[PDB]
Amino acid sequence: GSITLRGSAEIVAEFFSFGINSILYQRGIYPSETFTRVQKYGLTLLVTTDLELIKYLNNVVEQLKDWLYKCSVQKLVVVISNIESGEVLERWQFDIECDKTAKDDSAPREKSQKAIQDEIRSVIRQITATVTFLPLLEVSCSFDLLIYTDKDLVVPEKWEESGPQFITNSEEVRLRSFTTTIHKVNSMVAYKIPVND
């Protein structure tokens, strides 16, 4: 095979799925008895075997490739709001860059794993890290997956074309970023800012 994006999409796919899954544990989108802690990217990260979720991310990952990789994927935002009665409280936003000028394609294997390990290391850690930094939390919140494209993005009932909603009042804190000639992944999470009045 003479693929190109598939390579980056491979890491980017497992990267998002790993970083995302970890988010749910770090956040509390479902019972902890459903996830498994593993050592991927050379470091320890947790994962989940949730079928429903796996089915949610399956469609996302499947189309992420078809709909996103076939239209350029640049950034990703995640809106997490307490379903019980807390509105938007946590919003996990990560940047995704697929293919960064490489018309050559004359280099055996074009994918950075080491630099990846570092990012993914901080990505899995930053999620879990901030949580510990938070004063306890675990609400049956709802999920909102956001995707950032470039050209005209055509969506039916699957997604909602927008994004600027930028929550109502939350602070965004940078955690880490990485840019390679084959792809670039950024990491920054935001949560509801206290002191409303």
């Binding site: 909102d144 995707i147 494209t149 993005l153 969506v155 699957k158 997604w159 927008s162």
Partner: peptide, 10 residues
């Protein structure tokens, strides 16, 4: 142009 993905239901 970014997307918005809705959550589950029940």
């Amino acid at each position: 142009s970014w997307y918005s993905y809705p959550p589950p239901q029940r």
